[PDB]
Design a protein around this ligand. Sequence first.
Ligand code: HEC
Ligand code: HEC
Lengths: 85, 85
Amino acid sequence: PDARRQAQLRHLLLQDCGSCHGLRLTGGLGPALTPEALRGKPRESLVATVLMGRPQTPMPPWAGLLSADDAGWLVDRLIEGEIAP
Amino acid sequence: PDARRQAQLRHLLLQDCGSCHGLRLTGGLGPALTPEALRGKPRESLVATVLMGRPQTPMPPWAGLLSADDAGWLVDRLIEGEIAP
Ligand code: HEC
Ligand code: HEC
């Protein structure tokens, strides 16, 4: 499948397959962003990490693209677990 | 963030953030499709399940919408932990 098709297939993976099979950020190079792994951590601490990143790690700063509202919204979604598109 | 923006953030989370933070299809009502859960099952078996579903379950068949290559690609993504590009 070509790049255009790959994109259509990732969408299907996230919307249709993910509906029944669920979606979770179980962690790879970076830590898990599951509600269980973020339990009890100050919310503003997680928003800070998103906006400014973590120096000397692969976690980049997203302030270049995300406002403080955007980062807080994402963090709320990670805390709830409701990451489904 | 407004309607259109929340969607951008959901997409960003699933396809950009999910690469490092390990997006997986698991935690839903349906079974886990993580690499750990598919480790022993043959690829052609999983591809068959995608194309033909599993009778007497809600796992539907996808052959009409997906070619054999499409299904094999999807399975590779499940196996290789590459739901985010
Ligand atoms: C609910 C309507 C589902 C949707 C939509 C999708 N899947 Fe599914 N899947 C579902 C169930 C209840 C089961 C288990 C069936 C059983 O009792 O054995 C499955 C199973 C699979 C498997 C097989 C996993 C295994 O261990 O053999 C695969 C490979 C799979 N599902 C993939 C898959 C894909 C790619 C989907 C989107 C195209 C998809 N499923 C949707 C429930 C549902
Ligand atoms: C690889 C290039 C990454 C991408 C892209 C994103 N994240 Fe990340 N993240 C990554 C690493 C290696 C780490 C750990 C850094 C360290 O100090 O060891 C992180 C960390 C986070 C955290 C903190 C989690 C915690 O338990 O405190 C969060 C909340 C986080 N990252 C969020 C996040 C978001 C929202 C991203 C997309 C906008 C994103 N990360 C991308 C690696 C990578």
